[PDB]
Amino acid sequence: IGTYQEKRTWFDDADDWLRQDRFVFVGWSGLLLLPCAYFAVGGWLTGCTFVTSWYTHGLASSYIEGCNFLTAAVSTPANSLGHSLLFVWGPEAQGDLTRWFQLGGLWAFVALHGAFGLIGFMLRQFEIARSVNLRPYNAIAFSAPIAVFVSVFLIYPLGQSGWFFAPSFGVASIFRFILFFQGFHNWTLNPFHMMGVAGVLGAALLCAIHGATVENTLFEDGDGANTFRAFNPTQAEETYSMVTANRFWSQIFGVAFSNKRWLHFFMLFVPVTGLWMSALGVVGLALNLRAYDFVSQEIRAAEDPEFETFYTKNILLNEGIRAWMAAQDQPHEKLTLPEEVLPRGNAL
Amino acid sequence: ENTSLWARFCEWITSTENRLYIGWFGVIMIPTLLTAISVYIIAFIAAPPVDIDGIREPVSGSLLYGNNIITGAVVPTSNAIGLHFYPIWEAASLDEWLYNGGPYQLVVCHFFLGVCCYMGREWELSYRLGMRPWIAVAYSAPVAAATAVFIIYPIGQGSFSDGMPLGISGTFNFMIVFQAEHNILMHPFHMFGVAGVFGGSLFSAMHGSLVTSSLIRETTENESANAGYKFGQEEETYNIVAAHGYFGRLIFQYASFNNSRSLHFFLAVWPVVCIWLTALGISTMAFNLNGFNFNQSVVDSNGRVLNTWADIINRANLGMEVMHERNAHNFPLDLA
Amino acid sequence: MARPNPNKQVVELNRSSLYWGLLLIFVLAVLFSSYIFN
Amino acid sequence: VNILGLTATALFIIIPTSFLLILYVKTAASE
């Protein structure tokens, strides 16, 4: 530190060992990442293998109950628990680990440990980039998965009545969450979600295009028919003709990148921006501030029985989703709805 | 011979000096796509309502009939037509053609021909430029997806009314009804497609972040870092070795791509093969193969059904199912 | 530093960035106008 | 609404377009 005496302490020894290059880099961020991520992943696997959701949701959700990988989930606690942190020492479980598993505390365990593991992994990105003297754009890009996780698994249930309405960690439970947002929020109609979908699909397009453009604008650089052997990592010159790529895409699509920098950034920028827009939309949904209806079209439909649009059709479909989903999906509401109030079409 | 009329026409068509390449695939692509664009814009603005379900209950679709940009659509062809070819000259009047969903069929057919010839045109320009030809192979995956949603699913279901409406809310209606009838969420091909789009976003962001993180210092802080790259420079603008070292320290050493060629291939192949899989999933649910059905799979010792998340999804699907085409069904089974 | 401010910097916006900004503004208007008019 | 949404859309079009055009015209005159 600036040719100063810098007498060593235990911190210097700890940093020397933590930042030593091994098969798994630990660093100072490892002390947060590895335990939290390990506990989150292991808790999800443990819950999907052994832990039931029979008392919080009235559902079988583990392999030991007969579920498969698609239908097993670590499920959210009961809605009457609200936004309780569900500590195993907490006033609900009170130290009983088995009843803590039965009460849905494993969901809070997995969610909180996964959140702190995401923080630790972002700190790991920062620490490794600082160790190797690279710019921290990987962590800047990883900010968008963390924004999505925070808004979806924490902010949305915190805005709702309890962790019950958070997504349950599992395949079919995520599908439940998706169909719930459709029926109850009209989340497809939300412009923030539309921007998120545009970002995700444009990023997938950018990945595919790029990769194809690089692989098809390669310089020869060899003699064999396998081009993958014609690249050396220490090679100084480019492997692909940027000029030919630009010519091809300008003459095919009308526009092309001319700057490699700008292209890689754009590939960074599109999915991160899309995920951040979708996170803002989910924050809006946390307060039921939905983009659910177009009021002028609802007025025209109420005053005109001929007027039908696909938007009106989707409103009808959402009403059907809510009515046929509510009794089984929100048991705390205790909805014993007679079939004669369920909206139906004809015959079918 | 540079003087015969056909040779002059050929050298103009295959010229790599036109601002946009035409080629022989372009001589079909340009008129078909221009036809589709013209009809789509005109119909989206001012088309009269379309009896999509064939039940004499027309759906407006166009801005002039009270739609906005979100809810506006070109409405699919009438269910009474089914899979029959319905050109303008097969209608007694343009008004009948419009009432029965002719613009949708016209736009869909011309768009299919145009995207197939767009793929061929991509190959043709790659060949004329001395490139390698598989950008067209990469583009075949969105073409497959569009063909599945506009042609193959109507073929499997027996009616162009089952095509995806040319709109935003129409697209959402298509998705919801598709889930209700086929459980596309529980379909492995659709799971692969979701993995492909999520992985494409992840890998685009990671490439990107990595290239951007390893950029060589060529500029100052008051300039854009992009100014450090010149168009057509021979040297590499980033430290692939440093980026690979960062990625190896971040995840795993030997699990990292040490070949840019191999990395680009992976970036090309992953979303393309996954979109292939999900387009094939749509095409197979066209023939009613459907996603995983786990309804009432778990039962107790006495045989009582223990509901699962699949059963909750089934309740949502029933909610969509009993509501779509509320007046079009006279019989209980949804066989058509 | 001196009588002139030494921290003077010149802002730049090329035509590609102009096209990107115009596209962003008009596409945001297209997307959100239906919701604003409601 | 019919006219408040109209002025909102017009302002959201024009003010950022004005900003972008200022910067672009300044740049293009510079180069």
Binding site: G254 | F231 | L23, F26 | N2
Partner: peptide, 30 residues
């Protein structure tokens, strides 16, 4: 009224596309 706004916005977007294609800043190879 609102249909005019929607059509104007779409046509202006297409005009921006037209200008970005045919009046782009040309990629200079130096």
């Amino acid at each position: 009224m609102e249909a005019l706004v929607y059509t104007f916005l779409l046509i202006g977007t297409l005009g921006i596309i037209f200008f970005s294609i045919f009046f782009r800043e040309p990629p200079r190879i130096a």
